[PDB]
């Protein structure tokens, strides 16, 4: 699993001089790994990184910690791996997390960039499934 999606959020928070790492820093993480299924899916909805940065700045201790919901959505992404992917949560599982945990800053960025949550789910499921059924 490309854990680099997490292992950048401190760097964005520090760049923004924030004092927490939250569901929108996860979303910026997905933008920061353009290999990822999640990046491709969101790009197919034209949710480009520059607009995410714009909206995150618009909506918004030295050491940093996950918000209680960010912690929950990570552990929920590891529950989406109960779609039989063992413990290898990929970027798609994190995105299915943020799609299922439809609250907090990420859910606003989606609503504010007009993402249909169900179509995002469907697009991920179709990206993973056998394309000839």
């Amino acid at each position: 699993r490309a854990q680099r999606v997490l292992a950048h959020a401190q760097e964005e928070a520090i760049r923004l001089n924030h004092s927490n790492i939250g569901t929108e820093h996860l979303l910026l993480g997905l933008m920061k790994e353009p290999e990822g299924i999640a990046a491709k899916v969101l790009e197919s909805f034209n949710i480009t990184e520059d607009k995410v940065i714009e909206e995150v700045e618009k909506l918004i201790v030295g050491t940093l910690h996950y918000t209680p919901r960010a912690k929950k959505v990570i552990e929920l992404s590891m529950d989406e791996a109960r779609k039989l992917h063992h413990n290898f949560v990929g970027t798609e599982h994190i995105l299915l997390g943020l799609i299922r945990e439809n609250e907090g800053v990420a859910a606003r960025v989606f609503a504010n960039l007009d993402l249909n949550i169900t179509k995002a789910r469907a697009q991920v499921v179709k990206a993973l499934g056998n394309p000839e059924m």
Partner: protein, 98 residues
């Protein structure tokens, strides 16, 4: 509405909010209620703030707190007011960090 209410399951989560939250610089008053050993945080914005800056601020709260499970009228009746107008500042004065 101009009144936002969110539920904190424990004092430590309120302390987390008081230290780590960076709220949008906005004109509002805040109140902290308790019932059932359970904390409810409420914010009363000025009328000149727009409804979407309110929705924004609310959604930032949901990073730490749950959505409320009791109506505002119920809390204004039964709930003890613990602190008012500068809840975060008072918390951060009374309680040290993590």
């Amino acid at each position: 509405t101009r009144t936002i209410i969110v539920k904190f399951n424990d004092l430590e989560d309120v302390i987390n909010y008081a230290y780590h939250s960076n709220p949008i610089t906005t004109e509002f008053e805040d109140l902290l209620y308790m019932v059932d050993g359970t904390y409810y945080y409420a914010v009363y914005f000025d009328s000149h703030v727009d409804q979407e800056v309110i929705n924004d601020s609310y959604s930032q709260l949901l990073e730490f707190a749950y959505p409320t499970d009791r109506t505002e009228v119920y809390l204004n009746d039964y709930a003890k007011i613990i602190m008012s107008h500068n809840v975060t500042a008072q918390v951060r004065r009374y309680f040290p960090e993590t």
